[PDB]
């Protein structure tokens, strides 16, 4: 399994604008378009992003392009962030995927706010960190996805996704 398959499992694929778990306008593989209430602001962001008049709909190819961009941007963001980079550098490959997943979902800023959990991961205290990560709005709101990620940090294996 790899980061792309992992994220494809967690986010799904939709070719028409949709509302995400928080009510925001999204398309493709978890590509947030806008936090604005306007479907119209959404369609505008969409066309800008694709470079064509999409009228709310995109192809598989467009969805995957956006996905490539987003994953790339997530990685670079981690690498550039002073709080995240040292955590990432300290982790094994599987756990690295787990932090990427969190950043793709909640942005750099959000994950960088998980101060204590970051510290524990750095320290390789898997169990303790799993329990701290669960004490978050993140876990309460998207618990099955949160558990899958948490399990990945906990064990260092793809078990939570081998099912799926």
The binding site for substrate consists of 32, 104, 117, 132
Give the DSSP letter string of 5-57.
HHHHHHH--EEEEEE-TTS-EEEETTEEEESSS-HHHHHHHHHHHHTS--TTB
Is 108 marked active-site?
no
* Residue count of the chain: 164
Cβ(122)–Cβ(28) under 8 Å? no
> Could you give the CA distance from residue 164 to residue 161 in angstroms, rounded to a whole number?
5
Q: Which of 20, 47, 128, 147 is catalytic?
A: 20
Is 72 marked active-site?
no
Instruction: Please tell me the chain's helix, strand, coil percentages from 3-state DSSP, rounded to the nearest 5.
Output: 65, 10, 25
Q: Which two tokens stand for residue 58?
A: 């995109």
Residues belonging to the active site: 11, 20
């Amino acid at each position: 399994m790899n980061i792309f398959e992992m994220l494809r499992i967690d986010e799904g694929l939709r070719l028409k604008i949709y509302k995400d778990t928080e009510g925001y306008y999204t398309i493709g593989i978890g590509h947030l378009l806008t936090k604005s209430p306007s479907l119209n602001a959404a369609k505008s962001e969409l066309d800008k992003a694709i470079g064509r008049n999409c009228n709310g709909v995109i192809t598989k190819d467009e969805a995957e392009k956006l996905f490539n961009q987003d994953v790339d941007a997530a990685v670079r963001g981690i690498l550039r962030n002073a709080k995240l980079k040292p955590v990432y550098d300290s982790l094994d490959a599987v756990r690295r995927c787990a932090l990427i997943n969190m950043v793709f979902q909640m942005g750099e800023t959000g994950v960088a706010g998980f101060t204590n959990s970051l510290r524990m991961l750095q320290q390789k205290r898997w169990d303790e960190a799993a329990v701290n990560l669960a004490k978050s709005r993140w876990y309460n709101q998207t618990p099955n996805r949160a558990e899958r990620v948490i399990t990945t940090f906990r064990t260092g294996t793809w078990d939570a996704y081998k099912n799926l």
